[PDB]
Structure formats: C-alpha cells, structure tokens
C-alpha cells in the first residue's frame, strides 16, 4: 500500500549528498512547482529500493496489443522482465483483441501477467485513445485490489536500461523525445479553441509523451477518466484533437500538475534522435520500424 | 485538507520551465531520495499559491516563549505576520509559563492565536526537549481538527523574507546555518552507542536545525513521539544526548527521509555567518543577544 506507517531504514552506508555540488549542471532536475525531473545523476536507487521495499510496493504495467501490434508483445515483455522495477512486485496487464497470439514470456519471482481481452476498433486512433476509458474502466475494478501504481506505456518499445522505483509518485508524465528542448510556442499542443484539449500558446510547461504516464491508482484513473470525457465531449462537437489521447494528457498535466517529470531518458527513439551528451541511459526506447 | 481531490489550475501566464537550463548551477537543490532542497529560484510561488489556496490550506505554527522568551514573541509574532504564510489560513499556537506577558499582536484576516499554557522546567535543555513532548500531547488533540500542516520553530528568531507554502510536504527538515557545507564526519551528532540519538561517522546525509521542522498533522505527531520516547529511553539510561532534541531530530530524519528540506535560507544567523552569495534570501533568522 501507500502512505501507510513506514518503519525506520537500516544503517546504509553511501555518499554524502553535497549541498554545495549541483548534481546536473547541464538540466532542470526540479519544476517551478517542485516535482523532481528524474535524470540519471539525480537519485541513489539504494535508497529509493529501500524506501519501496519497506512498503510491500506493488506496480502495474498497463500495455495494449491490438491487432497486428501483438507482434511486439514478445520483447516488449523479455526486456521489462530485465529492466522494469526488478526486486519489486510486478503485475503485467496485456490489453488485446487476439488473447491467444500473447507470446508466453518466463517470468521472475513475484511477477505476473494477466491477459484482458477488449475490443478492437477500426482507426488507429481510435485504438490509441479508447486507452484512456478502457484504463479507467479496469482501476474501478481490478487496478484498485490489485497494485499500488499504474504505469501506462506504448508496446511497440522496448526497455534497454534501469526503469525503477525513482518514477514512482502520486502522478507523473514524461518529457517527450522530441520536444524536451523546444519552446511552448512550438509544442504540438491542440491549437483549436473548439476542443477540450486546447492550450494557448502562452501556456505550457513542457510536452509530455502519451507512450509513457502513471502514478498512484486514483490518480490515474482521475487523469483517464477526465481525458476520455474530453474526448467524449470532442467527439460529440465533431472535432478530434491533432495528437489524439496525447493531446488530452497534455491539457490535464497543465491544469494537475504532476508530481515528478521523467526525462526523455525513459521514452526515447535513437533511430531519429540519436543519443546526445544529455542523456546519460537510454531506457525505454522505439523499435526501429 | 490535504491529499483531497483537487480541483483544475485556471489559466496561467509564466516563464516557461527551462529544460536545458539548471535553476541553481552552485547548489544541490535535490536529495538522493528525491525530496526538493528549497532555495530561492527553485520555486515559483504563483503556482504553489494556487494549488495550496484551492485546498483552503490551513498551516499551524508553533512557539515556545517558557520563562524569560516571553520578551521574544512581539517581534516573532509581528514579523511572522509580514512574512509567514501570507494569504493562507494560520494558526498560532504560544505555548507558555506566563499567558499574561503574550503581547497583544494584531492579526491579519483568516489568522488566528491560541495561548496554551504549560509548565515551565528548570533547565532550558528540558524546556528544548520537552517540546516534543507538548507538541505530540496537542496533535492528538487540538491540532488534527484545526490544521493540516504544522510548522515548529525556535521563538529568538524573526521573519525578514518570504516564507510561504513552498515549504510544505509531510515531512520537513531545515539545513542547520552552521553545517551546510561540512562533511558528515564533522557533523554535531550523537556519537556514543549508548545514546537513542547516536550516528556513526559513516552515516548522515545532512545536519538539520532543532529551531525549524514540520510536516502533516500526521507526520509531525509521528516524528514528536518518536523523539520523546528516545529522549525517556535515553532518560532511564542516564545519557543526555549532546545537541538534546536537535540530536534526536537528526536521528529520525536519518532513519525517515523528509520528502522537501529546506535551504539555511530559511534557518540564519546573520552576525555569526554574514551574507553568503548562496543565499539570495535571508528569510528567518536568529535576533542579536
Ligand atoms: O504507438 C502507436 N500507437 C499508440 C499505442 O496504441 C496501441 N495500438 C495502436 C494501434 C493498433 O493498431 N494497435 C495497438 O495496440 C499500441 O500499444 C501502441 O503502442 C502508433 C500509432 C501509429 C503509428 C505508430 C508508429 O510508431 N505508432
Ligand atoms: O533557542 C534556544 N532554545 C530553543 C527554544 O526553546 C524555547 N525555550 C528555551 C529555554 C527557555 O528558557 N525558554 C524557552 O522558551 C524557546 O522557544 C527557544 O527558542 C536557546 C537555548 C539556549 C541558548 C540560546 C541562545 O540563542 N538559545
Ligand atoms: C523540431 C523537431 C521536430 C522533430 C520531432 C520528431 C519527434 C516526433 O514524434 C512524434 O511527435 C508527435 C507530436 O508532435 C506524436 O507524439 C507522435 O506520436 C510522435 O511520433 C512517435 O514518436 C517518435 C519519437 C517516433 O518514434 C515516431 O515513429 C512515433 O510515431
Ligand atoms: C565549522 C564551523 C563551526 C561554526 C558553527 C557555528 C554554528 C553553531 O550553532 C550551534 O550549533 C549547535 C550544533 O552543533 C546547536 O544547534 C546550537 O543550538 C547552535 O547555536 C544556535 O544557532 C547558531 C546559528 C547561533 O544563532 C547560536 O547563538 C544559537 O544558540
Ligand atoms: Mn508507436
Ligand atoms: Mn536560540
């Protein structure tokens, strides 16, 4: 559970912080609302497993596989088995339309997959957004019992490096890959007025990424069930947002801001980025295509 | 409250968040544990205004003015006026020997003061330690019901800056002005194994002030009992601990990461340690002997 009674730390023996040594020099590591920006430099994860670990910590892995997407399944799910929350207790959820074409994945101690079949919707779009009600629907039921924290991620990924407990927070959303660096102006937020997910060009603090959000159960559900009746509202005005679900992700971490921002460290594409000096990991990252 | 729902931010102009621009290049302005170091340039206050108005946050703060510190309060309590919490709903608790020498101090709307009358010990290291004491006995009782954060200062102080809701979290501590920059080794702590309070050289992430912590209702009343029962351990030991309920601070604070600490922007001595360049702000300090 969460913020239940929390016994002490063991003696641990680690480097003292030092107050008078910035631990980046070359990136924010904290919002103007101060939320942590989780860079590699940024955290000693001795500390943060300990913290998690005291607390029977249960984490939610949400991913969607319709239609021909179950072909990424297989690496999606060997790879997080090496680098997602490892030590800790992992509960897969694998939301799909063909229940039968899962890969069967070994998996570690402690961890485990349950298989939820949907419906499978014609437009791309559709499919990536009906994310957001289909969430919703199973934390009102399963996600609540279940685990702790929900992290809701994109399949055709695969992780590379360390994704641990430092992202855990009551909400949180990932500086997108391709924006991290770019002025608000810039930001392919929802410009038309006549949508719900419409932002301004005055305001913004950052793009987040759809493939890559989370945080504690209620708070995710909160975060999903108000982006899918924005889109619900959309639909019923005839507009769709220019980035679907990811506009309406964008326009809620505007007005509920969260509580930790993860670098683009942990949603990344190097076929069209590469890997540039600031990003010290590369852990959770594209499938070339 | 606290952890309520919460209602959208309304529209927002500000400078928009600088990724590739650190807030601070010559501080650590985030723990390993990933708790915010507040500094001045860390925060900006407009937004943390309004998230903790549209909570209707209400911060308890507490004093102690026992014997002679009576004298102290007028220029505590007026000061705090110009610089605690303005705009928030505050409630002063006094705790003291002599109800009739609390000055007459006059309140800004939605302020008010409670004089809690207690005894008074003959040693003012009782009088210090005893503290933890009353403060627990009063969360159980007054406090739960009237705030949701409680702040826990020494009275020999004034407010010369702003010291606002940037500060709260569950669990505070304050870097002690003496320290910020030594190593652990040459930290004040308790260093015989006899003692309740007692670290090794080799652990210790920061030496934290006795004169400025808080938290929750629930986690200041967690940190008080746990410091009393320690200092009746110690008591029925024969030991007293070298810094009394400083020392005892420092030990919970190791064994419980506080979630924000606070910069010694917030905790000063202007005639013993001038004006370092790595204080913007001199926002609560100690009051010339
Ligand atoms: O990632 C995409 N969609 C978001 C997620 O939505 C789910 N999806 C989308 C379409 C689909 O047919 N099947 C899916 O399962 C997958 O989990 C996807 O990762 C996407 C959409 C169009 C083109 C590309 C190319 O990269 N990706
Ligand atoms: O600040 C001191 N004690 C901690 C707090 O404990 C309370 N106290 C202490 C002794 C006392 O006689 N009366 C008090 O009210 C006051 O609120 C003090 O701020 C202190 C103790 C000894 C010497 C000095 C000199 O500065 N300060
Ligand atoms: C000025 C520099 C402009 C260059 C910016 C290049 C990144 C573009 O990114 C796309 O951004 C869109 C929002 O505007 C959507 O989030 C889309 O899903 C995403 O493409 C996805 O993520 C990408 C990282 C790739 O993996 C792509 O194949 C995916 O479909
Ligand atoms: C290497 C540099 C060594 C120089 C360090 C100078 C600061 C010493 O500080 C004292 O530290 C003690 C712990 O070791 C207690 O917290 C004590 O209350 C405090 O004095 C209090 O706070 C001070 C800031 C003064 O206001 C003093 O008058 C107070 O009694
Ligand atoms: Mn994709
Ligand atoms: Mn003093």
Known sequence: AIGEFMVSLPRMVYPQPKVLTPCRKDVLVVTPWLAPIVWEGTFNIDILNEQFRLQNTTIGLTVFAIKK???????????????????HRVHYYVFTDQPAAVPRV???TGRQLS???VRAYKRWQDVSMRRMEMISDFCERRFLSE???????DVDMEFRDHVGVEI???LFGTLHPGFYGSSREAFTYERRPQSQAYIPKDEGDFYYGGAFFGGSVQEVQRLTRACHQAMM?????????????????????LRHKPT??????????????????????????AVPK
Chains 1, 2 share one sequence.
């Open 69 to 87: 997407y179950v072909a990424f399944l297989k690496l999606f799910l060997e790879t997080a088995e090496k680098h997602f929350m490892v030590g």
């Open 106 to 108: 070994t998996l570690g």
């Open 115 to 117: 298989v939820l079949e």
């Open 147 to 153: 685990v702790d924290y929900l992290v809701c991620v």
């Open 168 to 170: 855990l927070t009551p």
């Open 233 to 253: 509202v959309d639909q019923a005005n005839g507009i769709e947002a220019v980035w679907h679900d990811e506009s309406h992700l964008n326009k809620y971490l």
């Open 260 to 285: 930790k921002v993860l670098s683009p460290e942990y949603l990344w594409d190097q076929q069209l980025l590469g890997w540039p000096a600031v990003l010290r990991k590369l852990r959770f990252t």
